[PDB]
Symmetry: D2
Subunit: 492 residues, 4 copies
């Protein structure tokens, strides 16, 4: 009751199960809540074109959700320096207590300490807890006090760890203080050119604290049960579609764990024997994110010692027109192309068809992986540098469990794994909507009298394949050899 504590959140835009919210209305009795936007010294790089578009709309949905729970306001202050914003706030607000939530990424790994040291020097009682992750990366260890180099045992230990915390209920209702009229900077998240041509994201995606709580609750009832068989299939709504919601924290990662585990229970005693297997498998898929946070917290992943050091001595072509063809739906490889048409039509693509397009980048285009990550970063809603780094490691050699860099997936039966009747291609790629599915991911291989049976005439409708696959798969093996050849040269 003493003063007005304040919470400042960045990737925990939710009012349910927000320890920071449950801490501020737990010492103080006046709680004003804030978000800051110092992007320049958020450091290169930024959040990307669409990761903004989402972020703006979440805030709106946080502001008018916040306002309802307790009429202040979401107080928007933009500055050159983050640390020197909460100081701008704390005098402004007239507050003695700043509470927020942890963030594990490198770019804000150090920021929190220097929002602690600079703030503790002003006797301000900065404190922050854990709502973004399920098992705190420093909470899990390795037989005697070491780390995990693979996924397998990190999860297998986590499984018979204890149960992680049930989600806290929201506060009853909260209240401001003087919205003095202290710091109302309206925020700029999108450039004015791509305002209109952004919003079609809203036709396929609907961001928000609320909208994410039902994003999950409508997954459990439906797509969950027959998920174990279909998680690989990309031609249907086979997956949670819940990842940007979980990126920004709009959905509590242990709300879900509680709910999933519950459904498993009911299904077991229901006698549904494939609901449990489906239900365990999902949990592992959430575990992948938990490991992502673990790996960046465990390994440097900062400046320089890069994530993909070990391709340092790799020779790839710096070709800026191959990349543009990749950027769009014109490579020649339909699986890659449907994915590529969807990413940039809608801002999300199935996991398994991320690998096929992201492998295709490094593997057969032999182009600098930095280029891919930026486009990914720029054009994805569910972009965390953390799990999207992990996804670039897995896919290209690195991770001891990640798949073989030396092997180029053959699209025809990597396409039967992920699109068996071939109707993923042909919701995005109707140019070839009619060529039968034997070789819908092949069109080159298939005979020239069948192409005409279904009006694909590569070079009018659907373009001939960039880099005819055989001779990149040669040249990767030579390229890998120079890697091996010149890493032992500078092992001297």
């Amino acid at each position: 009751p003493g003063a007005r504590a304040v919470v400042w959140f960045r990737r925990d835009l939710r009012v349910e199960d927000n320890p920071a919210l449950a801490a501020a209305a737990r010492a103080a009795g006046e709680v004003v809540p804030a978000y800051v936007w110092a992007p320049e010294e958020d450091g290169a790089y930024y959040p990307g074109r669409v990761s903004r578009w989402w972020l703006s709309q979440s805030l709106k949905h946080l502001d008018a959700s916040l306002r309802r729970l307790g009429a202040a306001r979401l107080v928007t202050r933009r500055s050159n320096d983050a640390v020197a914003a909460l100081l701008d706030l704390v005098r402004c607000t007239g507050a003695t207590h700043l509470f927020f939530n942890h963030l594990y990424d490198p770019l804000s790994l150090v920021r929190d300490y220097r929002v602690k040291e600079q703030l503790a020097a002003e006797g301000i009682d900065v404190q922050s807890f854990n709502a973004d992750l399920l098992y705190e990366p420093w909470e899990v260890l390795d037989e005697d006090r070491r780390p995990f180099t693979m996924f397998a045992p990190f999860w297998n230990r986590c499984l018979c760890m204890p149960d992680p915390a049930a989600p806290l209920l929201p506060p009853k209702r909260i209240n401001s203080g003087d919205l003095s009229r202290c710091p109302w900077d309206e925020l700029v998240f999108e450039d004015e050119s791509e305002r209109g041509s952004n919003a079609l994201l809203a036709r396929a995606w609907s961001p928000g604290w609320q909208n994410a709580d039902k994003a999950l609750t409508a997954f459990l009832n439906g797509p969950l049960m027959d998920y174990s068989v279909n998680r690989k299939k990309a031609d249907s709504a086979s997956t949670s579609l819940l990842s940007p919601y979980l990126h920004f924290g709009e959905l509590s990662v242990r709300k879900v764990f509680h709910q999933v585990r519950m459904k498993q229970l009911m299904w077991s005693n229901d006698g549904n024997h494939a609901g449990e297997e489906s239900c365990t498998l999902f949990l592992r898929s959430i575990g992948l994110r938990e490991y992502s946070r673990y790996l960046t917290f465990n390994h440097p992943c900062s400046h320089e010692k890069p994530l993909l050091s070990h391709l340092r001595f790799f020779p790839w072509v710096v070709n800026e027109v191959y990349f543009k063809v990749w950027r769009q739906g014109r490579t020649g490889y339909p699986l890659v192309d449907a994915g590529m048409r969807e990413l940039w039509a809608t801002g999300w693509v199935h996991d398994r068809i991320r690998v096929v397009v992201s492998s295709f980048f490094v593997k057969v285009l032999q182009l600098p992986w930095r280029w891919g990550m930026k486009y990914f970063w720029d054009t994805l809603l569910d972009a965390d540098l953390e799990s999207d780094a992990l996804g670039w490691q897995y896919i290209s050699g690195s991770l001891p469990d990640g798949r073989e860099l030396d092997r180029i997936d053959n699209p025809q039966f990597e396409g039967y794994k992920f699109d068996p009747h071939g109707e993923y291609v042909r919701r995005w790629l109707p140019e070839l909507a009619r060529l039968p599915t034997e070789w819908i991911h092949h069109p080159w291989d298939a005979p020239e009298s069948v192409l005409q049976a279904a009006g694909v005439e590569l070079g009018s409708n659907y373009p001939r394949p960039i880099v005819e696959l055989d001779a990149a798969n040669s040249r990767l093996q030579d390229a890998l050899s120079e890697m091996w050849e010149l890493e032992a040269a500078s092992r001297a």
Copy 2:
């Protein structure tokens, strides 16, 4: 991992959010679970005819749910002495740790201590926690350290108390020990005469750990939202139908609180302004049970100083044929009679039409309230002596907030409150299915040429009213006067 702890539950038949289960598989690594049946020295009285029928079926649904989570068995041991059964068990099981769950009733208020003292003397580490109640009755107090004499402020304080514990998730999976073959007594819950004629309960009710978890989850989606308006209406599925499930603990009382409070959240930001009011009102209705546990823990309610002391000097007629007519659907009062036909057809009746039949017992029949409670006890599934005592206090004078003993409700517009179009009567009472609803709860008052317009001919179809209301409502006031007259006589 050291030995085999054991849990013994009585009114907490559930595997989710069972601290006892989460305690035994938390010291020990072998967990066998048990239930005992010493009814003779469970003390007069028993659990009643149907409260058994439910109990048997729950166990079955606990045994084969227990078995699946971890194949032992539900170990059934019947004895003359309860205390001397766990000793029979602990040697048998070869166990060092007995954990169970609290029960607040008087009949087992003392038992737990003497399952502690006798068990602590054998160095056995008896311990037990809180899963049956939401706010522990000793956790709430009164300004300076006193108690609550009404409902109003007990809840109003509880509301801005803290949030009560989120429900614990079930254990992953558990395991026996040697089901030596140590104590398998098969249990007798129903007499063999009323076996067949019991089970129609199963057509309207379906007991079980599981069945209760979906009893709730199908309430939230449907009847919850438009509950604030309809909680009084008894002609539709206006209520949770969730009370026997919550009596035996099959549904966690703070599973529900979490879920309710959540729905309130989503509805508030949904803009549904009547979902919140509906959602708060339900919560109070759960609060009524919490107060029930509070009142019995607070006030003696034991041997003798009875719950309804203050009718001690009341003169009622000991008439055993009035009671039999009450027992069935033949009183003459249709509201009372539909309720009475339903209680004994199905084992549950709406709250608000419990008061009309339970008032009718004390008020116009002027019959010994003990008689009512036993039938209630004998014929209800959702029978706890605790809340069903509280419901007999409220209804007859006692509780400072309970309604006036001196006033006899007039059935005609107490029937419009609770059955406005009159279709509760006429699902149970079709003898008069056709007399229009102006006076469907009246039939006496209504004119003798209308009775014939709808073929009620009181004394063939639907019997003339026992004790024509006017002259019991006289005689209660005289009866109350002798109470007042002879309580001041023995205030000498």
Copy 3:
């Protein structure tokens, strides 16, 4: 275009597939439509208490349906003489052409001729066609030019007869003439006492031209398919519920034949092999009505030579209290009693449980069948003297295919045929809602310690059986013997 023809309908209240409507707006170009109410010389007897209640509401639904198709009015004229009403109309209307629809019953068999002879004498061109029946009773004959004495071959011939006429579409839209203000008598259909206590019929039934068109269309989709198995079961919505609609003509009897036969088609090629059998069986059930019209047209059934001549020399008890117990739910026989509670609660009962109550009248009560028919006539909505005569013949000896008069059905497994789990009894008869279903139709036979297991105490709840079955089944056989004994006496 010449003048204003007029249509007058009595048991064809519908605007679709009404040849009379399609004839008047086919010579004339002005069409006014009318209904008359001469009940006194409609002849004893009347239409019964509820057959009115329906009739009033149909007219209302014809008047405002008529008005919409073409704003006149339904013109209501009540008179002592029917014939002298259309003369009152024709001058009034200023009309040259009166068209209506055939009615096959005896009471209006002669009326139509003397609405022809008296009207043809005034040079008025009376004409009328066929919309009430499917195969015109004079259209079907017997090998060489004879009649049918059983059902079996009447239908078997009708089956490979030709297809009967598809239903005509309604007129586009029609128009009056001067609603001069010529004959507006408002009509009296119900006595003012039983106005209010009639309408609960509206809760279970909803009469009307329109409401009947969807009464059918919602039958085909649902209850039709699994009708072949369930037509006998009375515990569910196993049947069309379409008979009063079809009595008054609100549903075209060959609209349905077309629709049924269509569904059979689609199901056959659907591969549904039980939809065809179900679909044929329904058709026979409609055939029963067609035969009814045939039998009254074929056999005198008029004044006197009564339908049940051959029980003329039968001795039954004239007891007016047995009949009153029958009238209500108090006989002692639950199957009979549920039916009896439903008839008079709602105005319709399943066919198969009509026989059990209507047999019970003649067979074990041995009471004058006239008494039953009047109550049936008075309390049924789907009352045509035509098919409800046929149903009294079939059930009591007469019809060569009707079941044996000498045999009294034993209620226990006539009740398993028609109510196998026993939940028909116990939606209407909840007094015994709890006694298990082994002997729910028996209660006498079942042991006195089970009655108490389920609180039936015959003589408080559910009354002991009138005429304990054995000794009526004796006495029918003696009664039948005196019939046989004294028919051969007056074969002298």
Copy 4:
């Protein structure tokens, strides 16, 4: 019963409401049914690539539907001469009576007479009736005995004509004769190259006698009611999707008229005031087909005096690469291009977006209309030369009510009429899935900094517009002038 009559159908593949079927099992008592395939002297031209694919599958669905109704067989005989096939049949079958159904097209206008003259000379009683059309083209006339030159009054008269015949019910069940083993030629409908790449038609369309009966019955319940507003909108399932079914006769054109008109009735009395307007409007849309049959029966439309005589002296460019771009989705005009991607992906496109692509052919490509019709003929399922001629007349000058040839529709607000939010484009044309809908049908006009806001880069993704619209709309007006200029030259 005398002999085996035979029916031969060509564009009436249905067993319900097939007068030919109802005629053969009405003189004869043995009925064998047949279809012939003489395509060479069916005359140029053929039926097109997909009109076959449908036709094969219908037969299959007729053969095994025929077989079930009555086990013969559909007897498939292919010949050089049609007339000399039924002679091959009639001896073969040993039959005296050949009945079929009328076809109004020119190519078989004469065939029927010379399947009559050659067959009547062999004393064979050829006869055939009317099942393909609703009002027989010789049944409607013009004030005094003339014809109709516009649609408007042809329908307005037809409306207050009489009601056309209700649909006949199928036969009960029929039977062969000796399937001697007389003429079983298996039929070739598709070339073996385009077998596989044809069938995806089956994913969007499902042909068949049966499948068409439910194609309609699921239209009435849903899309019918809100059809009056949405018939123009092409972005949803706004229309019957019932036209190929109605082309081949699989759906009876007066089954539907009956059903539609019925729904109108129920909606009127339902009070739905927009169901009637919607229901009338559909009927007119069926009327368009009726007029089509009328126009070809009325006007020569044969050899030579072509349908589009009056563009005889029109100069268009014979350019075979403009046409190929049209053939596919690459014109530059998104509305045109989505349509063009759908036609050839799926074999059907909305009516209103047929005009925009078919106008675009004649109007801005200024290419020979013959070229369009063949592709239409080749790639449509719902291809009748009859109504698809009429649709080419209407769209290009001809029909006195058809729209102005001189005016080129401006795509931007012809696209708001037909695709208001722009989601038709972007189910077929996702290359531009993201450019906002202000100018999704414009992409040229819209500014070069917005193209980049949504990654359209015309010349990588979605190609720059063939013939930049302005200067075809110039050149049509010059082209029209030479028409006018050189028709008056040869009016000399």
